[PDB]
Design a protein around this ligand. Structure first.
Ligand code: NI
Length: 341
């Protein structure tokens, strides 16, 4: 049944709750972003109001064929009324179109639902600065101190410098980047920019990108693989067998592959700096795992929460085991005692 952490008290609202059938007493279904674990259940057959960003609403219409009359896009950073309740959508610094939602309850309670987010000090100057938030529904993906990772900017610098050096040393090398969802577009776009290439991809993935309101996108991507030396493939194909296979398909235009897998966290983070990352190599194929995250590190999460000073935290991630739930609750209490709220 729908878990309590997807329901907003004092309203008829749910968040990211599309896979439970008709949720009893739900008048409006919010969707924070277009990732499958969150939209699971939506289709052209859905006939309740979906509230979301503009970009999310483009993907719902074009990719899932949801009917236009049930898509209610809202502008960001704008006080809006939904079924008699004031709400605001804020940028979540996750994937394109991802939002956090502020709910102003009739009784005076203020609730923030982060959806999925990568906390940033820039959030401390949004409309969140303007009033007190009583309850926080928190993306706790990486809520443990072992989870460190570099800035997105440091990771993109490493990727651009590695790609540029490789292709300048061997003008017959092909670059390949993995993907399985929207998000992390900077990785393949930054690499294509330094190389003076468009990124080549499947018609399905091209259609997905054309929904994202990214400026000048027609100048950066293409479905003509032959004209491109940065290719995007399913993340599943980013292995020596899949890459050898792909190389055959390019008809001797290329004699080497340099591939990137933009992972979340992986344990070499606990030891190794970005400067010191090395690839796995077999013959003329090299694969780099790069820690490009669109979720908060432990320290980023901690800073946001100690800034906001909520009265109550409701985790939305890692809630399935008692050991995770108890570990998370211990961190929340530490943060509260350290900061004095
Ligand atoms: Ni997500």
């Amino acid at each position: 049944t729908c878990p309590f952490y997807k329901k907003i008290p004092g309203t008829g609202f749910t968040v990211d709750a599309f896979q439970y059938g008709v949720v009893e007493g739900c008048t409006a279904y919010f969707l924070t972003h277009f990732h499958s674990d969150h939209y699971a259940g939506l289709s052209k057959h859905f006939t309740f109001p979906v509230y979301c960003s503009e970009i999310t609403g483009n993907l719902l219409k074009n990719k899932l064929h949801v009917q236009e009359q049930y898509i209610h896009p809202l502008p960001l950073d704008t006080e809006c009324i939904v079924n008699g309740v004031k709400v605001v959508l804020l940028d979540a610094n996750h994937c394109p179109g991802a939002v956090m939602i502020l709910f102003y309850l009739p009784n005076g309670t203020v609730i923030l639902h982060t959806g999925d987010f990568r906390a940033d000090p820039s959030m401390e100057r949004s409309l969140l600065a303007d009033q007190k938030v009583h309850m926080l529904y928190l993306d706790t993906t990486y809520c443990s101190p072992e989870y460190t990772f570099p800035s997105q900017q440091e990771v993109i610098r490493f990727a651009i410098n590695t790609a540029f050096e490789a292709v300048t040393l061997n003008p017959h090398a092909l670059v390949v980047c993995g993907t399985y969802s929207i998000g992390k577009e900077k990785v393949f776009l930054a690499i294509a920019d330094v190389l003076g290439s468009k990124v080549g991809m499947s018609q399905e993935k091209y259609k997905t990108l054309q929904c994202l309101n990214i400026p000048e996108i027609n100048s950066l991507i293409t479905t003509d693989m032959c004209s491109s030396l940065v290719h995007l493939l399913p993340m599943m194909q980013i292995n020596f067998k899949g890459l050898q296979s792909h190389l055959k398909k390019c008809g001797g235009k290329y004699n080497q592959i340099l591939a990137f897998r933009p992972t979340g966290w992986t344990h070499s983070n606990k030891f190794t700096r970005i400067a010191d990352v090395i690839p796995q190599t077999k013959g003329n194929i090299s694969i780099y795992g790069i820690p490009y995250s669109e979720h908060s590190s432990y320290l980023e999460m901690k800073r946001f929460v100690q800034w906001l000073k909520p009265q109550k935290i409701i985790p939305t991630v890692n809630v399935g085991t008692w050991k995770s739930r108890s570990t998370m609750e211990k961190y929340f209490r530490e943060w509260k005692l350290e900061a004095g709220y």
